[PDB]
Design a protein around this ligand. Structure first.
Ligand SMILES: [Mg+2]
Length: 99
RNA sequence: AUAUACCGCCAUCUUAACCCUGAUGAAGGCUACAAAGUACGUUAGGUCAAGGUGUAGCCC
């Protein structure tokens, strides 16, 4: 339901995403990502689509950022201190290619 | 004579934290082609034959 305002219409029972809204949303998201990278924030890409795990890991390694395409264990973010150490720094921005 | 004196030795019997979910209820938390989970006494016991310490008996 919450995706309805972003849908241009249905073409033979297939939803079509309004690309005019996608352009503005992508502009805002890319501006935010660029500003965060300028401030040397830790950027973590996340995606459980196994068809693109290799590509996303390669991209994250290429841009000097971090990736998590594997099984997400309980408490990686909400219990990070116990799972990594008391002085671990969490990501400043998380990018979901697949939500 | 006494282990029905003790030991020695045999045998009997009794005997942590953290993180999520449920509207922050009792409560719950797993799937790998992965979906919240990680950190001693007891006995009128035997044995003084390969071991000891005492205790009492008798002494016309
Ligand atoms: Mg006896």
């Amino acid at each position: 339901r919450f995706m309805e305002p972003y849908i241009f219409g249905s073409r033979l029972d297939h939803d079509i995403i309004d690309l005019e809204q996608t352009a503005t949303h992508l502009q805002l998201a890319l501006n935010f990502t660029a500003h965060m990278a300028y401030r040397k924030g830790i950027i973590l890409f996340i995606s459980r689509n196994r068809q693109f795990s290799y590509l996303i890991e390669n991209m994250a390694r290429d841009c000097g950022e971090y990736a998590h395409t594997r099984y997400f264990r309980g408490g990686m973010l909400t219990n990070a201190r116990l799972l990594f150490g008391p002085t671990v720094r969490l990501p400043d921005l998380i990018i979901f290619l697949h939500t």
